A paper describes a structure:
Notably, the most commonly reported pathogenic D2 mutation p.T61I33 occurs at a position facing the interior of the D2 PF fold, suggesting that this mutation, too, could promote alternative fibril structures. However, the two valines in the VAV motif, which are found at the PF interface in all other protofilament structures we have observed, are flipped towards the PF interior in the T61I fold. In contrast, the aggregation rates of the T61I D2 mutant did not result in substantial alteration of the aggregation kinetics of D2-NT or appreciable signal loss in NMR spectra. However, the T61I mutation in D2, which also incorporates a large hydrophobic residue, did not result in substantial changes to the aggregation kinetics of the protein or in appreciable signal loss in NMR spectra, indicating that other factors beyond hydrophobicity influence aggregation kinetics.
Here, we demonstrate that the low complexity N-terminal domains of both D10 and D2, as well as the full-length proteins, can form amyloid fibrils in vitro and in vivo. For D10 and D2, the central conserved VAV motif forms a beta-strand that is associated with the protofilament interface in all the structures we have observed, suggesting that it may be a critical element in fibril formation and may be expected to appear in ex vivo structures as well.
Author numbering:
A (entry chain H), B (entry chain G), C (entry chain F), D (entry chain L), E (entry chain K), F (entry chain J), ...: 54 to 87
């Protein structure tokens, strides 16, 4: 029984082009993870 | 019995082009994950 | 018995072009996940 | 017996073009997921 | 016996073009999922 | 015996063009899913 | 039973080109991880 | 039962080109990890 | 049961070219790791 | 002005079960394609 | 003006089960493609 | 103007199970491709 | 103007299970590719 | 103008299980590639 | 204008399990590549 | 204009398990590469 | 214009386990490379 | 214009475990490289 607060599971990834945010956390301001 | 607060499961991914946010968390402001 | 608060399961993904938000969380303001 | 608060299951995905929000959560304001 | 609060099951997806919201949650205001 | 609060099951999907909301939840205001 | 506050699991990654943020944490402002 | 505050697990990585932030922490401002 | 405050685990890495920040911590301002 | 000697264009495909020949060429004997 | 001697274009494919030949060339005997 | 003697273009592929020949060339005997 | 004697282009591939020949050339006997 | 005698282009590959031949050349007998 | 007698181009590969031949040349008998 | 008699180009490779032949040449008998 | 009689180009390789032949030449019998 | 009779180019290699032949030449019998 595993837990993931933020999970992005992509086994096969092939990106020809990606301008800007890509598969990440663009967090701004606040985030209460405690 | 696993739990995922934010899950994006994409086994086969092939992106020709993606300008801007792509498969991520563009979180702004607040998020209570505790 | 697994649980997913936010689940986007896409086995085969092929995106020719995607300008803007794509398969993500554009969360703004608040979100009570506790 | 699995549970999914937000589920978008799309086995075969092929997007020629998608400008704007696409297969995601454009959540603004509030969301009580606790 | 599985449960899905929000389910969009589309096995074969082929989108030539989709401007705007597409196969997602454009949630604004509030949502009591607890 | 499965249950789906919001179910949109479309096996074969082929969208030539779709401007605006498409196969999603344009929820505004409130929704009591608890 | 493992836990991941921020998890991005991508087994096979092949990026032809990616200008800007890519598979990371662009955190600005604050983040309460304690 | 392992825990990862920030985890980016990518077994096979092959980047043809990546200008800018790539698979890292572009943290600015503050971050409470204690 | 191991813990990693900042973990970037990439078994196989092959970077053809990467101009700028790459697989690191571009921390500016503050970070409370105590 | 494109030409296709054998064309089977099916944008959205969802096959629950298919025992035997399925969406292919079961060519036996001869075929003069020159 | 492209040409395809044998073309099977299926953008979105989702096969639950397929016993036997599936989306291929079961060529036996001869085929003059010169 | 491209040409493909044998083309099977399937952007999004998701195969739950496939016993036997699947998306290939089961060529036996002869084939004149010169 | 590219040419492919045997082309199987599948951008997004996700195979749950495949016993036997899968996305290949099971060539037996002869094949004149000169 | 490139040429490929045997081409199997699969950008995003994710194989859960594959017993037997998989994405290869099971050539037996003869093959005239000169 | 490049040429490939045997080409298997798979950008993103993620194999959970593969018993037997996998992405190779199981050539037996003869092959005239001169 | 490069040439490859046997080419298997896989940028991102992640193999959980592979018993037997894997991404190689199991050549037996003869092969005329001169 | 380079030539490769036997080429296996895999930029990012991550093998969890591989019992038996793996990314090599299991040549037995004969091979005419002159 | 370089030539490689046997080339296995793997930039990033990370092998957790590999019992048996691994990234080599298990040549038995004969090989005419002159």
């Amino acid at each position: 029984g595993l837990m993931a607060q933020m999970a992005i599971t992509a086994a096969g990834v092939a990106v020809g082009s990606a301008v800007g945010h890509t598969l990440g956390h663009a967090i701004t301001g606040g985030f209460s993870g405690g």
